[PDB]
């Protein structure tokens, strides 16, 4: 019965740890995906924003009831 | 009321003030309830404009149905009674049924329950919440059993303020339930369904787990 | 590399996709029509070589979903090829068939029975091109495969015998044409049962041989058998549709979908079979116009289930006018009801 | 030996569970942070379109009743 206690504990906890780490991998997949699309946005947006600033500066330079109630 | 014709059309009274209503997704059908005693649950066709349908005598004491949803599937109607302990009942309104198909009554602890919604991806799933508790439902018609769970959120889940919440809804594509908060936050749950080894036993009816909290504004 | 569509040179890029290769304008145009009007870009997700799937579960997922997409498009291409053969667009069939074959080679490998359907379509296109010996090549391959084959189903072997018969039908021995179509009909009968449209397709080719033999009574018998099959199946759908629409009404109501339940390629083959059957049934024996009325009913039903409304109406009107002189009221009242359903729907 | 080994193993396992929960919630916190940052970035695009049109441009019925 002691050996059965050992076997049960070993197997159960080994499976538990494998499950928990593989779940961590599953959430890591989403983590990486988001980090990728976040940084794609951050780069492309900051590029766009800066060229907007340049174009707006160029635009700036180049462009240069009451009575009825009564 | 028609804005451009500038004319009103009317659905004729209740024994009490109208408590809650929901329209079918196709806007063919309109359902309504009234508060107080003697309440009647009364359902209507938009485009006859003089329709009739009724559930008599739905509850003896129950002070009218304080929230009610209709299936976009259009087979079923489901209701929450005003009462000191509230009722949950499902109704095969396509039939001339005048009695509950299945019933459950719930602890007071959940509180006034006054939002209810049907799942467009299902026929046997509903969500409801009070200000202060949220509830998942599934109806096992072959068993004749309606099962509920109403787990309790606390700070511990995120070590964060969460406070009071108002409405809950079935996600677009995922096995998930959404809850919107006064706190500026959304809460989301996942549902877990009887694991095969459980099937030989109680097969504990599907459990809801609060996977995620995020602040949106 | 080569023009994958014909193994002539990669003379030009497929500007639609880059991944397709053409022996210049003629095959560029024909393959554009054939595969690119049907799907075009979806081959690009197939053609892209994968980046590294990093773990066993990633490799398995990526392979499974890629392979099952490949299979799905393989079958869609094979359906498109079948329809092009039935539509007579043998030029367009040649790309679709060659693609379906090559993708079957890639997933299944050349040795597979799964190529045999494509090989037989490539025979059928070759016979549309009159390239009898070219069809004999792919039948030779199929025949060796099936003779070795450990598992060839009754339907699969019926396909083999049917195309073998068709090849001899381009050849010159009517005895072989009967022998092989008879084998096709047997294997169809045991796979499907005796009243399937595919069995009837066998009976149809047999009837056309008996008509060429001018054995009018046997030819007409076969045409009758086929016509009855088509009638019975379309009746099964048309009746079930009307019966369900009639059967019950909660206050919810309902409306049921008017539907052939056929493959569009099976609908095209139905039209080819029924039309040739009608013309041969008249020209062999105008003495039985009621069989023409039956075929007109059959086609009017098919057209309604398609919502080929124009021919549905025309062929019902023909059937009604003929049935009033030739036939009892049951025929006329059926055709009137069908017309009322077409005109209401 | 056999018992003392089993007991200490179970204790170790329990703390393994503690660690697993700790990291799980840490990654959930990460996901929250990423979601916030996504929203911020998507919003930040909104302004950019507006101004360029200005360069092209440079070149009580109630009381009535
Ligand atoms: Zn291409
Ligand atoms: Zn070529």
TrEMBL record, chain C:
What Gene3D superfamilies does the entry give? 6.10.140.2220, Tetratricopeptide repeat domain (1.25.40.10)
Molecular function GO labels: zinc ion binding
Pfam families from the entry?
Answer: zf-MYND
Q: Fetch the InterPro entries from UniProt.
A: TPR-like_helical_dom_sf, Zinc_finger_MYND_domain, Znf_MYND
Detail which positions bind Zn(2+) 2: 14, 17, 20, 36
Q: Which UniProt keywords apply?
A: Metal-binding, Zinc, Zinc-finger
Protein name per its UniProtKB record: Zinc finger, MYND domain containing 12
The lineage, from the top, is:
Eukaryota, Metazoa, Chordata, Craniata, Vertebrata
Tell me what gene encodes this.
Zmynd12
